[PDB]
Every structure is written in C-alpha cells, then in structure tokens.
Design an enzyme around this catalytic site. Sequence first.
Site, PDB file in Angstrom:
ATOM      1  N   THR C  12       0.858  -1.214   0.000  1.00 36.11           N
ATOM      2  CA  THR C  12       0.000   0.000   0.000  1.00 36.11           C
ATOM      3  C   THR C  12       0.886   1.252   0.000  1.00 36.11           C
ATOM      4  OG1 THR C  12      -1.805  -1.171   0.993  1.00 36.11           O
ATOM      5  CG2 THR C  12      -1.826   1.222   1.298  1.00 36.11           C
ATOM      6  N   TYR C  25      -8.294   1.584  -3.634  1.00 37.40           N
ATOM      7  CA  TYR C  25      -6.929   1.694  -4.203  1.00 37.40           C
ATOM      8  C   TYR C  25      -6.451   0.302  -4.628  1.00 37.40           C
ATOM      9  CZ  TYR C  25      -4.811  -0.240   0.070  1.00 37.40           C
ATOM     10  OH  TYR C  25      -4.430  -1.056   1.096  1.00 37.40           O
ATOM     11  N   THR C  89       1.758  -4.433   4.285  1.00 38.09           N
ATOM     12  CA  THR C  89       1.587  -4.586   5.751  1.00 38.09           C
ATOM     13  C   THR C  89       0.996  -5.967   6.051  1.00 38.09           C
ATOM     14  OG1 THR C  89      -0.524  -3.439   5.677  1.00 38.09           O
ATOM     15  CG2 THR C  89       1.417  -2.079   6.086  1.00 38.09           C
ATOM     16  N   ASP C  90       0.205  -6.525   5.124  1.00 36.59           N
ATOM     17  CA  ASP C  90      -0.625  -7.738   5.358  1.00 36.59           C
ATOM     18  C   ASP C  90       0.252  -8.898   5.841  1.00 36.59           C
ATOM     19  OD1 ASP C  90      -2.695  -6.179   4.573  1.00 36.59           O
ATOM     20  OD2 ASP C  90      -3.196  -7.313   2.745  1.00 36.59           O
ATOM     21  N   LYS C 162       0.651  -7.470  12.872  1.00 38.64           N
ATOM     22  CA  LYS C 162      -0.423  -6.513  12.507  1.00 38.64           C
ATOM     23  C   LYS C 162      -1.585  -6.723  13.484  1.00 38.64           C
ATOM     24  CE  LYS C 162      -2.680  -4.635   8.342  1.00 38.64           C
ATOM     25  NZ  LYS C 162      -2.602  -4.590   6.860  1.00 38.64           N
ATOM     26  N   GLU C 283      -3.197 -28.914  28.161  1.00 34.14           N
ATOM     27  CA  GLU C 283      -4.207 -29.998  28.034  1.00 34.14           C
ATOM     28  C   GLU C 283      -3.710 -31.080  27.067  1.00 34.14           C
ATOM     29  OE1 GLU C 283      -8.370 -28.682  27.973  1.00 34.14           O
ATOM     30  OE2 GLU C 283      -7.598 -26.629  27.816  1.00 34.14           O
TER      31      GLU C 283
HETATM   32  N1  LIG Z   1      -9.778 -25.944  26.954  1.00 34.86           N
HETATM   33  C1  LIG Z   1     -10.557 -25.162  27.953  1.00 34.86           C
HETATM   34  C2  LIG Z   1      -9.886 -23.818  28.254  1.00 34.86           C
HETATM   35  C3  LIG Z   1     -10.522 -23.031  29.386  1.00 34.86           C
HETATM   36  O1  LIG Z   1     -11.707 -23.280  29.691  1.00 34.86           O
HETATM   37  O2  LIG Z   1      -9.822 -22.172  29.960  1.00 34.86           O
HETATM   38  C4  LIG Z   1     -11.979 -24.991  27.412  1.00 34.86           C
HETATM   39  O3  LIG Z   1     -12.256 -24.064  26.651  1.00 34.86           O
HETATM   40  O4  LIG Z   1     -12.870 -25.788  27.719  1.00 34.86           O
HETATM   41  N1  LIG Z   2      -2.780  -5.389   0.815  1.00 30.44           N
HETATM   42  C1  LIG Z   2      -1.698  -4.448   1.212  1.00 30.44           C
HETATM   43  C2  LIG Z   2      -2.000  -3.779   2.557  1.00 30.44           C
HETATM   44  C3  LIG Z   2      -0.993  -2.720   2.970  1.00 30.44           C
HETATM   45  O1  LIG Z   2       0.156  -2.769   2.476  1.00 30.44           O
HETATM   46  O2  LIG Z   2      -1.368  -1.848   3.787  1.00 30.44           O
HETATM   47  C4  LIG Z   2      -0.384  -5.230   1.231  1.00 30.44           C
HETATM   48  O3  LIG Z   2      -0.070  -5.891   2.211  1.00 30.44           O
HETATM   49  O4  LIG Z   2       0.368  -5.218   0.261  1.00 30.44           O
END
Ligand SMILES: N[C@@H](CC(=O)O)C(=O)O
Ligand SMILES: N[C@@H](CC(=O)O)C(=O)O
Lengths: 326, 326, 326, 326
Positions: C12, C25, C89-90, C162, C283
């Site tokens: 960009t 753009y 930036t992407d 980002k 886990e």
């Molecule tokens: N693996 C768990 C993580 C949590 O609860 O902190 C769950 O989402 O059930």
């Molecule tokens: N699509 C663009 C976004 C940016 O540069 O801000 C790129 O990463 O080339």
Amino acid sequence: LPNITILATGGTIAGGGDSATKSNYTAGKVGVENLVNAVPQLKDIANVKGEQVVNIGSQDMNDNVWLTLAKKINTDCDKTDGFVITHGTDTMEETAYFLDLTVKCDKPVVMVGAMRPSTSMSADGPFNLYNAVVTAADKASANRGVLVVMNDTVLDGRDVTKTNTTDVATFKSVNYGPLGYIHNGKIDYQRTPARKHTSDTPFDVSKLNELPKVGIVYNYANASDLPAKALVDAGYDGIVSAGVGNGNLYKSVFDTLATAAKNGTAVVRSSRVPTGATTQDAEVDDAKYGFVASGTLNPQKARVLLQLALTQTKDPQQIQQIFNQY
Amino acid sequence: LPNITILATGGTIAGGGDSATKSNYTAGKVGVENLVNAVPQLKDIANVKGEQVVNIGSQDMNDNVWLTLAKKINTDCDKTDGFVITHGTDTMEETAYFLDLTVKCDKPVVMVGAMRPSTSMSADGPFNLYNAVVTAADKASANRGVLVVMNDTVLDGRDVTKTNTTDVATFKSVNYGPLGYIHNGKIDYQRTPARKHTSDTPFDVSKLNELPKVGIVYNYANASDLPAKALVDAGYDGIVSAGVGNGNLYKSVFDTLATAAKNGTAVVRSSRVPTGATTQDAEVDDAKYGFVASGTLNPQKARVLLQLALTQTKDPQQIQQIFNQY
Amino acid sequence: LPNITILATGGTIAGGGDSATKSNYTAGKVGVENLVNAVPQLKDIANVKGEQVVNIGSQDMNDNVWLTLAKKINTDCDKTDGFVITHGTDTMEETAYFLDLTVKCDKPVVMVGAMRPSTSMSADGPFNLYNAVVTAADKASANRGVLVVMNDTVLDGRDVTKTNTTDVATFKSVNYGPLGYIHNGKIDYQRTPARKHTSDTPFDVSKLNELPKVGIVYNYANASDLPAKALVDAGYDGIVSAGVGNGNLYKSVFDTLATAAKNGTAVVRSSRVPTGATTQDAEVDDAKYGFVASGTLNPQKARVLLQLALTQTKDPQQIQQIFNQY
Amino acid sequence: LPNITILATGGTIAGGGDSATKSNYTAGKVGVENLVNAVPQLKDIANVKGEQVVNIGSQDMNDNVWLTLAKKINTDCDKTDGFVITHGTDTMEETAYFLDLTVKCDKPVVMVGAMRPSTSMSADGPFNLYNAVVTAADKASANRGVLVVMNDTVLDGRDVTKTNTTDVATFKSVNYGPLGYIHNGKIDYQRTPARKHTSDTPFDVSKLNELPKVGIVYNYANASDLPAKALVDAGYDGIVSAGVGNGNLYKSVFDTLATAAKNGTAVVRSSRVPTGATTQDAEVDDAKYGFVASGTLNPQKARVLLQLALTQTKDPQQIQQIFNQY
Ligand SMILES: N[C@@H](CC(=O)O)C(=O)O
Ligand SMILES: N[C@@H](CC(=O)O)C(=O)O
Ligand SMILES: N[C@@H](CC(=O)O)C(=O)O
Ligand SMILES: N[C@@H](CC(=O)O)C(=O)O
C-alpha cells in the site's frame, strides 16, 4: 449539503515548524481559513464557515475559553447543522468534557486536533479535520454528546483521554471504548455514552463569567502536603486528589484534605492510574471524611465535573450523586 | 534448593476483610509468617525466610523505608540466594525503581503485591507470592535489575507501572513490554533492560539518612501555580512537572518553574500521559530554561531518579545525562 | 552520509487510488524511484539507491520472493551500509521473521509499509520511509536482527504483528514490546531480541530454490478435518494448527494431525488468540503425540520457523528445541 | 432473591489437575453442583439451580450443543429470572454470539469460564462464577443481549474475544469495549450494544436439528488453496476467509473462493488480524466477486452469523445487509 461551523482555538493542528523532518514547532500559529484551504474535499461534504475563537496551545487552555465556547455553541446552535472545534491535544479531553456537560445544542459538536504539526511529513491534521467534518455532518452523530474524532475513531467526551505523548493514535476511551470507526467517509456507530450529557445536565454557564476554583494534588511516596495546604490557604472551592491506586492518599495529604473537607472544601478522590474507577467501599471511608469518589473520571475530568457541581451544590452526598450520574 | 529471603513491607497482599465477597478491607495487617504458611508449595522450590521490615499501606511509602530496604538488601546480599519484597501495589512501581538504582546486590530482587486482599474469594496473593519466589530462585533472573512479578509476568523496575485501579493484570511495562512470562514454574526470558541498574549506577545511599526534597506538580486547564510556588518557597531541591501531552506546562506553572530553574532548583518535565517519552526538541527549549526532559519516566519515577541524581550533582546538563543513562 | 539500498516489493506504501479521500486503491503500482523522490529529505540523512525486486500486494507474498530477498541482502551485503525493504503490511510480519532467520548480513535490515495509499490524505508512507532510512542509518540498529519500522517505532521481526485492520499504529510487538521509539530522527534503544536471529541461526537458504511445504488449519466450534486431510493428502512436510486458546485442537482436527505426526508430518500447535505463548504441559501431551508447541510464535510465524526447521531435521524433539531457541 | 439457573457445559472452570502448583490439567471434569458448593456466598445474592447440559472442553464445542443451549433457555425462560452458562474459555466467544443471535428470552444470559483450573492456586473460577450470578441477578443486565462475565467485567456477546492464551484478564471487547465493571457486587453499566440481538433478530433455531455447514480457511504468504478446495468439494454452504490485513486473500485462495462464490457458495471476507473491521471499498471489489465483508466479526464469529444468515437466504447482498445489522 449541511452547514457546519469550525471554531478554532489553536493547537498543533494549527502548529508549524521550520522543516517537515524536525520535531521543533510552535502551536496556534496558522489561522482557521488556512486549515480549511489545506483540505478542499471539505466543500464536497459540507458548507464550512471558519471562526477564530482564540489561537492558543491547549497547554494554556482555561475557564475563560471554556465559557466562550459553551456560550458560542449554545447561542449559534440554530444558525448551523453541526460544530467542529479545532483544538490542541494536550487538554482536548478536558475541554471536550466541559462542553459535554454544558452544551445545550443537540446538533453534533466534534472536537479534532493533530499530533504532528501542519508543516510536518505525513501530517495527521488534514485527514483528521475531514473525518471530524464527516462526523459533525453525519445524521447519526446527534444526541451522542460532545465527540472527539482522531485517527479514524469517534470517541465520547467523557471517557476520551490522551494515552501517549507523541503517537497519532494517542486518543482512546480507555474504560468503555469508542462510539464508532470512520471508513470511506462513513461511520458504523455501535455505542452511545449512557452517562447524562449536554441538555440532560442541570449545568448552565450562560450567565457565568467565572467557575469555582478547583486544583489537583498528586499522590506518591513521601508526598508533600504543601500543594494541598496552598490551595486550602487560597480558599479553593474544590481539590481533586490524583490518588495512588484506587484513589488512596499519602498520610500527610490525607491529613490536609480530611481537615479541608470538614472546613468548607469539596474533596474528590480520583487516581493517577490512567484506567479504571476510584471506588467508594475501598480502603477510604468517604462517608467518615466527607470525600467524593470520582469513579472512572481521571483527575482533570473530575475537576471539570466538580467545578460545575459547585455551581449547583456544596453538599458532598449531592456532588457524589452528581459523580454517579454525569 | 536455593535460600530466598522475603522482606515484608505490608500491602493488600497482607490485607484482610470480614467478607470474601465484600470489597471493604484494611492493608498491611497480616504478618509475613502467615503469607508463607498460606503457600506451603513454596518449600517445593526454595528455602524461604520471612522478615517484617514494616507493615504499612504503600500509599504511605516514604524515603525512610526506601533507605532501610536498600541498606538491608545490600547488607544481607551473600546470606541469601535472592530477595522477594511483599509490598502494596499503590507505589510498588516507585520502590521498584529506587531499589533498581541503589541495590548493589547482583542476586534477584523481586517485588510482589496483590490487587485482592488475602481473605478475598479468588485471592491473587498466593500464586503471586509463589511466582515471585520462582522468579527470585531462577538463575536466569540474575543481572536483570530489580523486578516486579505480577499476573504470571516478570516486569523490569524502570518501566513497570500500575495501569488499572482494581484489575489483577494492572501491572504492565507500558513502553518496552515485559522481560518474561511464567508458566508451570518456568520463565521464558526474551528481554532485559538496556538502561543501567543496580551495581552499574554511581548512586550510593548506604551513608544517607535522608534523600533530597523533590515534589510533583500537576498540569491541566487553568492550572494553579500555588503548589509549585509552595515547593520553591519551602526550598525544594527538585520539582517534577506532571506535564500535559509531551511534558507541556500551563503558562503560570511554566513561569514559576522557569524562575525556580534560574534560581538553581532542578526542574524535570514529565507527563500525566500514561505512556510515551517527554522528549527534548518539541515546544519547550530545555537548554534555554535549564529544564530536564524525563523521557519515558512518569512523574513519580522521574522523582526517584531526580532525588538520586541530586545526591551526585546540581547541574541541569549533567542531570539530563543521568536521565539519558538510567 | 551512509549508503542505504531500498529493496521495493510493493505494498500500500506503493499503492494508488483515484481520490485522496476515497478508500478504494490498488497495491504495488508506483516504482522505487517515485517513492524515494516523493520524500526528498532522505538526501539529508542517507545516499539512497532504489532497486525493484517485485511490485505486488503482500497478500500475494510467497516463498520465491522470500528466497530472492534473502540471497539479495546476503550477496549485496558488503556493497551498502544498510537495507530498507518497502513491503505490504498484510504479511510484513512473515517476511520480516523469514529474513530475521535467513539474513547473514550483520548490517541493519529495516522493513516498511503504509496503512494509507501514497495518494491518500495524511499518507503515512513518506514519514514511515524517512524513519526507516533513519533506523537503517543508525549504527545502534546493528546486531538487533531484522527490524520493522512503523508509526515512529522500531520493532523486532520475531514479535512484530499486525494488530489492527486499518489503523496506522497497527504494528505492535504484543508479547515483549518494541526495541525503541523514533523522535526528531533519533532512536533511544532500550531493548534487543534475546532469541537467536540472522547470523546466529543455522538456516542457510543460499542454494535453496524451494521451501518445505507448510500449511495452516484454523480451529473453531464444529471444526472440519477436511482442510487438514487435504494438506496430509498432498504430503505437506509440516502443518501448524491455529489452535483455540492455549493451542487446543477440535477432536476431528486432533485425530487427523495426531495420525499425520506419527507418519512423519511435522505438526506445530500455534494459537488463533493474538497474544500469549502456545505452551507445553497444558491440556495436550505433546511428547505422546510428537507435536511441537509454537510458544509466542503466531500461526503465520510458526509456519516460517517450521519451514526453516524442516531444512535441518524432521525430528520433533529437535524442532521443539529450535522453537525454544529461535 | 432472584431465581438463577446455571447451565454447565464443562470448561477449565470445571477443570482439575493433580497439583495446585503444576499447569497440567483435564477440562470438563467437575460437576455443576461441585462448582456451586465451592461458592457458598451464591445463596446471599440468588436462589441458584444447576443443570449439566454437557461436560466437555470447549475446544470440542459444536452446533449440536449450541442448538440444545438455545432451545433450553428459550423453553425454560419463564421458569427462572436469569441464566449463567459455565463454559470453556477457548470457544466461549463463539457460543456467546450464537446465543446472542438465537435466544428469544429477554432475561439476562451470562457466560463464565476460568483460565485457571478449580484445583489451581488463586483459581479465578469461584469469584468469576459469583460475579456472573451478580450480573445475571442485576435487573440492569436485562436487554443488553447475551453477556460474558470474566475478571470483574461485563462484555457483550458480539465483540468479546479471547485476547491471551493464559491470562485471567484474557477476555476483552477489543473494538467497542466492555458494557460495565463489577465492584463489590454492583455494576456501573455505561454502554449497551446498538447491533440488534436475542429477540430483536429474525433467526429461529427452535425447529432446526442441523446448521448450514460453514468452514474457515487461513490466509498467509504462499497459502495453499487445498483447504478452500476441500470445503467446496464437500459442498459447504458457507466459507469464511481468515484474510490478511483488511480481509485480503492470497492469489490461490482468492481464485478458489471467487469460483466458489459464482457457483452458489456464500463467502465472507474476515481477517486473522485481531481488531478492526474487514471493510468494503478497499482492494477487493465485493460486488464484482459476490463476497461479503465481515466488519468487526473475526473469522470464528463471522462463521456463527453466516450459518444463521444461510437459514434465511443464500443471496450474497441479503447476507451482507445481515452482516450490517447483527
Ligand atoms: N480448553 C478449555 C480452556 C478453558 O476453559 O480455559 C476450554 O475451553 O474448555
Ligand atoms: N494489501 C496491502 C495492505 C498494505 O500494504 O497496507 C499489502 O499488504 O500489500
Ligand atoms: N501543545 C499542543 C499539543 C498538540 O496539540 O498536539 C496543544 O495541545 O495545543
Ligand atoms: N493501598 C494498597 C493497595 C494494594 O496493595 O493493592 C497498598 O498499596 O498498600
């Protein structure tokens, strides 16, 4: 297209330096006309009239300008569809909250500034002012209180605060968040501030030529009571404590303000901590000392509400209810 | 197992309330032996020794406790393998930075607190204290200066600040981020502060029974010059400006400190703004007024370094050099 | 003045639209010379030389551009004083980390983009480019690994990601923070990445014309195993899971990836959640399944290190140690 | 006191390890009654009933549990004054938003988890569940849609997302901020979501035993189109793209989804980037390809709404308008 009045107070948005790449600059140099002229796409969006209120660095912002701005907006409300205030970033959050509580106009009042001078490389001022006029012109922006528009973001006047000393992204509503984001001259509003503002407040400064005197005292390790004693000796109407943590006070500051609270002075406990509320049922018995807890209002914003609270009442319980409502 | 010494000073970590669910409590009432015995898993990782230095809320922290803490750590350095300081959250970021500049012991000094009292339903103190001793016992913690360990994160004493009034996660190093995260009693260190600390500083408090007088004044719209005047009238050695935006001063505060600087008071420009540096070469000509830019040091941390800088020199130029190095 | 080579890949920063006030753009339109000439103040700080390597949107960035960039910097190292890479930036955070691991040139490599196109009002690109050359020209920037300079901030290539979709301040080192801040063309460095980078890695791509095949599968409620099975069926050398929470898998995705891991596919557990380490001893029994925990590396960056790991070894324990060291 | 029903699905809140010290644990292990009895103070603020719906880790959450949860609350709405749902943290942001769009009961539905297992030192589970019942029991909590209560904060079901892999403060509404903060069993609500929810949505799952199949593909440098192709081959009704930056797609994945969109597959552009809107009118002509921009909805949340969108319409312009309303 809607008519919108730009009220210029100065700031870095109207600031200039001797080169685009040097950091050295002076605020409140450039006139309102030069600002609008620098962004012709304003004409596509609204009929802009620029008026110079003052040309000041917002570090020198004061009650007299606050009074002028409120009276101007309230007086001229019928003769325009919306207001933009060009303003310095340093105290934007103070002015924004003053007007948030004292503007009776129901049409959008949008404040805007710049973190880079108007002469600097990649100056933020131009696009900031465009987005501010977009917000002030947007039908959806009415009845949401006094707004600040900065870095493609619409922020309510109560919660908005400067988080960084240099960054263009400095302004955030750090407790409850932004109202809406601006993309392609269009706003997706998802939030409105619940705390009562503008016409829903009993604060009327139309006849007032001054405000009650409220200073701010800082808390830290081994803190001097001399600042607190200086405001007390001058017969200040209010003192806001920038407390440590949950609005706590150094022992010697506590002593002075506890005395002051029982000898006329309204004492509000706020916090130096940039985020979160100064609560009631903490380590301080506010009932016992006759203190007010600021909640999410940071010291400078607590000063604004206390000043305006002091035009209505001296009674702590009523000031506390004011601090729970506005 | 390593020998770690716990120096208790008070705080909500030592705080207690009548209800696990009510928020009302008093600070620094519980004794060090109780905090240790509350965490019996400590003797899995280290041989712990508790010493009560003081038992106060850190809102009442002061020069005398700071001088005591530094002299005790410096004296007992090679009787232990590392230090944990249990401490109130309110001013822990001030004490942390003082010890960071004055401790000559190269072994880990880890400061720890709690945002909920010891009696609270989901009290943070126990796991906080465990992770504090884990950090203090870790060989990799050596030569990183004085540390704050809160919410499973190791934070450098210089940049660590209280971000939120009530949140267990309140402590963040807001400009340069943390040194390491703690999981399963192990630390992945990916950073260490560039700025010189502990035995790399010229600061020596071993023979001092007082520190130079440095006070803090707040800047805001219509700011009173009385706090400032009070401090120069009391003959304060230094004044830190809690400046607006990039260390800017309300004209009245500016005039008083400009006069104080010419008369020989050390004046440091910091910021109320919670992140970012107070820079040179913005709106204030520091060379002309003989002011010092604080950089990333917030007002209460600018005070710590100004106090210690004044034990070395009174020259503004050499104080700035110190603010560029430490 | 130092000699600074600009390697343009597009983005960009080199993007253009019909209007300064319109979002629409296309990326990678304008050439290196146009970009450099658009900011003539570069002549103050460096002798700037432009080379176009590609002109694409970084959404189309690939293994081939990475290899070219790496070999270019490695071969042309001793001809210039530093490199600045103009880039979208992407996927700047992917390219930055690749070069962070593969560059052997001990001279500053700085990557830059823009969130607003070159034709945009208050375009960030010009001052971004200036600050990138400053960083590349600063002797202090040496031996800090490959750098990303965005919004007056120097960021290490490993942790930089980002954070926001449209915000000029989007780029943050979310886990360990920035290396330094840029004001008035000067940097205060307070940090350097601890993890091995550039010359300290064994990853030599000088003679590689291809990278091992590594794909990313997303985890969510009722997640399909089909994306995973597709990559296993193509015989992908590695799969990194964008896990939920602490790098957890949906049962179906777990089932496919578990079987694949035992067949010799390198399986790396990363997380969709934007901050925090995907940790061992959670886990999932990594040792039992022969999975690798990505730590602080997000899925994108987990890919880049796995690819490079698979050029040295196919052994899970060895890849794990590589993830703990780089 | 209010009657509050607790619907248990499992999660780390119902999780247990072999040690308070060590990180290793198994999720969805503990029964609803054991969580209730672990918080005696619940009876102080409400008359609490418990029902086990499922007992799983939320990494295994699925459409079937969603439909059961929605129908249970909708059926039993008249039997109680509020619902708390104990749930894993990993996919709680997905379940919250599904219920946000499907529950027709106007009484508070509050979701809770714990980042530390019930056996852990300073386990967050107990006080988390207390504060959820507080929110569920607060009349002010009504008409705000489905809520998530974690770390003393009330978060809307739409914007709330898991921000950090291990941090007790992980859950943030990253775009628009929280609704209110909880201190001493009381909530200062200052915000409500403007986006239509619960009974104000046209979505009815009362008769549905199935949900339209919607898969998620990840974009990155050199991204394989195989995952996308695998979903299209299996005849998925919807595909959500975890785009790069402003919802951009790698060359390979773009072609596949461009093909898929023309041949009846509903395709939503979201972003891997954790904050900000995937907007229209950037680099992708949504009209030309028949794509939908997800806005602030992250990939897992864009899936939830696309599933529900697909029960009304398969017209991309109809689906886009739905993404602008809910
Ligand atoms: N693996 C768990 C993580 C949590 O609860 O902190 C769950 O989402 O059930
Ligand atoms: N699509 C663009 C976004 C940016 O540069 O801000 C790129 O990463 O080339
Ligand atoms: N000192 C300036 C700072 C700025 O506007 O950026 C002001 O507030 O007027
Ligand atoms: N007032 C207390 C607060 C805390 O410890 O959390 C203190 O700093 O001592």
